Amino acid sequence: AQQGVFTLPARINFGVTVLVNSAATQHVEIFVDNEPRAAFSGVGTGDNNLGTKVINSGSGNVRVQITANGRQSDLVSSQLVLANKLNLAVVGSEDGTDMDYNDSIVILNWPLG
Amino acid sequence: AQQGVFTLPARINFGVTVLVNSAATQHVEIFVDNEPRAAFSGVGTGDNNLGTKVINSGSGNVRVQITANGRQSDLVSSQLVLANKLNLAVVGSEDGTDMDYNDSIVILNWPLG
Amino acid sequence: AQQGVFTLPARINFGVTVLVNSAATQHVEIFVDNEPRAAFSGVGTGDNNLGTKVINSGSGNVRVQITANGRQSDLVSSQLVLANKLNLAVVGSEDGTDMDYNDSIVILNWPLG
Amino acid sequence: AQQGVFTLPARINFGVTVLVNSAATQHVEIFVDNEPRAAFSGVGTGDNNLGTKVINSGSGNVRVQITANGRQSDLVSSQLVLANKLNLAVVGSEDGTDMDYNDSIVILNWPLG
Ligand SMILES: CO[C@H]1O[C@H](CO)[C@@H](O)[C@H](O)[C@@H]1O
Ligand SMILES: CO[C@H]1O[C@H](CO)[C@@H](O)[C@H](O)[C@@H]1O
Ligand SMILES: CO[C@H]1O[C@H](CO)[C@@H](O)[C@H](O)[C@@H]1O
Ligand SMILES: CO[C@H]1O[C@H](CO)[C@@H](O)[C@H](O)[C@@H]1O
Ligand SMILES: [Ca+2]
Ligand SMILES: [Ca+2]
Ligand SMILES: [Ca+2]
Ligand SMILES: [Ca+2]
Ligand SMILES: [Ca+2]
Ligand SMILES: [Ca+2]
Ligand SMILES: [Ca+2]
Ligand SMILES: [Ca+2]
């Protein structure tokens, strides 16, 4: 199945947070309606936090893309709703051979405020 | 039910990341085996990222507590495993009356590296 | 937080499946827009399957209620989305003192077909 | 990533429940330590419940395979833990072209009793 693709509520602001656990530099792009809207990059094996950016969901079509060594990483993803209110969309990724799926971890959350 | 309580693998390094969406200052405490082992404080309504800390799980008994206004916030939590490998333990919290459950969001993840 | 309450897409058919793991007889009622729409009951400690019923979500306001020994059980719940398509809303419940939260397990899924 | 593969506690009894939403007959196989240990077959587009079977996890290595039309279906999966106690491992699957991922839905849960 496709992974890293989520349908958000339309026209909502959401946060994107990235953690890295890799020796290879990670490059994360968030697409909204097939257009690039947020970029992150970094490297480190200590759950290193690349920060959070807030962007708008447009029609709702959000895709997470993660590249390392020039290749798009293998993605795994899920969406969780807590208390019928807090939404988290999570992406793990694998850039190599050890199948740890933590090389970049991308977390989307909404609503904010 | 109790919320914000997780059993991790023993003696594992794990990351704790905190996001806030609040006007009241948030205080997050992470306990390992009932001992206070990580703290975060901050405020802001736009998904303010308070960073990530890496700590060890001890016997495995990890608990998240969140306060604001000198009072414990109401917690909701779940654990997710992706690719049979990437673990996320998520806590949402409510400090007030609007039931948005985003006032502090605490993410635990393992394994690292 | 309230547990066992989910917002479904409006006017959608969804399935409700119940498993029991209890010595006490379990009584499950599913409410849609505050009206009773599906009932299940049974007893057994072997993950005993009470079957599946398909009902309609109305405005979308769905609540799971679980009673044993005349008392509403303590609920825990979450919603999961897989492949940006398959939705599962899960409720565990505790009727007693052992905190196993399996006494009735209620699974909602959509879309069908 | 591999999907439908889960590590359970060793030597634990767990339940497997299958729902189908398909016009093609579904065949679900559960492997424990690479040995074929539970089977289900059925068909129907209205969330047809094929029942629950209880089996033992052996060393803990559990795999779900789903076929229809003599071919392995595309799998998507996650594991959820509620109340730090109730485990659900969920598999959705697609046998065709409509990408609804509900053709067989396989739910594993533990602990029982
Ligand atoms: C050297 O190992 C690390 O870096 C590689 C990328 O080179 C990752 O895939 C792996 O999981 C480790 O984090
Ligand atoms: C003023 O409203 C904000 O701040 C309060 C107190 O932190 C939160 O409960 C609420 O959800 C908003 O984020
Ligand atoms: C006797 O123990 C069982 O039944 C009680 C209800 O009596 C449940 O709470 C418990 O988890 C067991 O399933
Ligand atoms: C005819 O359409 C149905 O049957 C096929 C084959 O099982 C499924 O892929 C599809 O989602 C529908 O449930
Ligand atoms: Ca890796
Ligand atoms: Ca890694
Ligand atoms: Ca709030
Ligand atoms: Ca808030
Ligand atoms: Ca119980
Ligand atoms: Ca029980
Ligand atoms: Ca299909
Ligand atoms: Ca189908």
Task: Walk me through the topology.
Four copies of one chain form a homotetramer.
Chain A: E1 5-7, E2 13-32, E3 35-56, E4 61-68, E5 71-72, E6 74-82, E7 86-94, E8 104-110
Antiparallel strand pairs in A: 1-4, 2-3, 2-4, 2-8, 4-5, 6-7, 7-8
The complex binds methyl alpha-D-mannopyranoside (MMA) (4 copies) and calcium ion (CA) (8 copies).
One calcium ion (CA) binds next to β2 of chain D.
What does this structure look like?
Chains A, B, C, D: InterPro entries: Ca-mediated_lectin, Ca_lectin_sf, Lectin_sugar-bd. Chains A, B, C, D: One of its GO terms (molecular function) is metal ion binding. Chains A, B, C, D: Residues 6-112 form the Calcium-mediated lectin domain. Chains A, B, C, D: Ca(2+) 1 binds at residues 21, 100, 102-103, 113. Chains A, B, C, D: It holds the Pfam family PA-IIL. The structure is a homotetramer of 113-residue chains. By secondary structure, the first copy, chain A, is mainly beta. Chain A has one domain: Jelly Rolls, CATH 2.60.120. Helix content of chain A is 0%, strand content 71%. Chain A has no helices and 8 strands. In chain A, strands 1, 2, 3, 4, 5, 6, 7 and 8 form an 8-stranded antiparallel β-sheet that branches. In chain A, a hairpin with a 2-residue loop joins β4 (61-68) and β5. Chain A starts with a strand and ends with a strand. β6 of chain A pairs antiparallel with β6 (74-82) of chain C, so a sheet runs across the interface. One calcium ion binds next to β2 of chain D.
Which labels suit this protein?
mainly beta; eight-stranded antiparallel beta sheet; Jelly Rolls; homotetramer; 113 residues; 0% helix; Lectin_sugar-bd (chains A, B, C, D); Calcium-mediated lectin domain-containing protein (chains A, B, C, D); globular; binds calcium ion; binds methyl alpha-D-mannopyranoside; Ca-mediated_lectin (chains A, B, C, D)
